[PDB]
UniProtKB/Swiss-Prot annotation:
<comment type="subunit">
    <text>Interacts with ARHGAP26, GRB7, DCC, PIK3R1, PXN and SRC. Interacts with the ARP2/3 complex.</text>
</comment>
<comment type="similarity">
    <text>Belongs to the protein kinase superfamily. Tyr protein kinase family. FAK subfamily.</text>
</comment>
<feature type="domain" description="FERM">
    <location>
        <begin position="3"/>
        <end position="323"/>
    </location>
</feature>
<comment type="function">
    <text>Non-receptor protein-tyrosine kinase that plays an essential role in regulating cell migration, adhesion, spreading, reorganization of the actin cytoskeleton, formation and disassembly of focal adhesions and cell protrusions, cell cycle progression, cell proliferation and apoptosis. Required for early embryonic development, embryonic angiogenesis, normal cardiomyocyte migration and proliferation, and normal heart development. Regulates axon growth and neuronal cell migration, axon branching and synapse formation; required for normal development of the nervous system.</text>
</comment>
<protein>
    <recommendedName>
        <fullName>Focal adhesion kinase 1</fullName>
    </recommendedName>
</protein>
Amino acid sequence: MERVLKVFHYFENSSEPTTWASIIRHGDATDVRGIIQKIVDCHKVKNVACYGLRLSHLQSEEVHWLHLDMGVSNVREKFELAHPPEEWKYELRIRYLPKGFLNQFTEDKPTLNFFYQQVKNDYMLEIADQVDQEIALKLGCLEIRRSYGEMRGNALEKKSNYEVLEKDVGLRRFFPKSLLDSVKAKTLRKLIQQTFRQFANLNREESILKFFEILSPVYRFDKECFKCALGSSWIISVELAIGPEEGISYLTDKGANPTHLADFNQVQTIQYSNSEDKDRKGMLQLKIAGAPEPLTVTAPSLTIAENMADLIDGYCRLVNGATQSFIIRPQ
C-alpha cells in the first residue's frame, strides 16, 4: 500500500533544530519531486525548483542525492538492502541556486530562512571550530540579533540578559566550542557584547544577509566542487566547480577565478554509467549545444557521477521552466 518516510528539513519550527522534520506517506507511484513539492508547499515556498533530497548513512560521510524523477519506494528499497532504516537519514535541501539567489530569496522568506538555516548548520558543523575568532563572534552575534528580533540593541549590556544566554539557552547554539573554551567566561561576555554592538540595528533579513556576506569569504555555499577528469581520449585531471555564478567550470590556481566551460542552459542531455571495464569509476556525459564534442567526465565512483548528474539535471530544470528530466535512462 504505502510507507511512512521521515524527512529532515530546515524550516524553523520553535524547538530543537535537529528535530526539524516532516513525516510523509508514499506509494508505488510517489516520486522524489512529489515528496519535495508536498513539503515545500506546506511552508508556502515560491522557489520550489531549488530543492533537492539528499540521503546519507549516519555511519559514513557517503551522500546520495535522490533524482527528482526516481520513485521513493524504489530508491528506499535499494538502500534498505545495504543498511537498515535507522542508519539512513533523508534531508530536504536547497541544492540548485538561481543566478542571484540571495537577492531572489528575499522575496521568498520561507526559502531565505531555510537556506540560512541549512548553510548555518553546515557552518557550525564543518568550519566553526577552525575559523577566526572575529568571524565566530560576528556570525554568532548576528544569529542572536536575528533569533531575538524584538530585543533591545543594548540589551546584552545588562548582565542578566546575557546570563540567560549563558545559563538557560546555551552559547553553544551560536558559537563553536573551540571559542567558548579558548577564552574566559568574562572576556567572552565582553567580546560578545562589543561585537553585537555593530549589528544591533540590523533587522532579521539584514542579519541573515549580513551573515552570508561574512561567511562567504571563508566558506563557499554557492557552489559544489568535484575532483575528476575531462575528456574521451586524453583524459585530464581537474576539479569541476558547479554553481549559479559560474555554471560548469574548473579550478586552476587557488584564489583565481574558475574557468567557464558551459552554461546550464546549453545542456541538452545528461547520461551516466559504470566504467566500461575493470574499474570502480563512473562516467558522465553531457551533450552541450554550441559544442562539437560532448563533455565526458570520469569521476572516482558511480555514486559521485550520480550525485553530479542530479546537480546538473536540477540546474537544467531551473534555468528552464522545465519539469522534464534531462537525464537519459533505459526506457
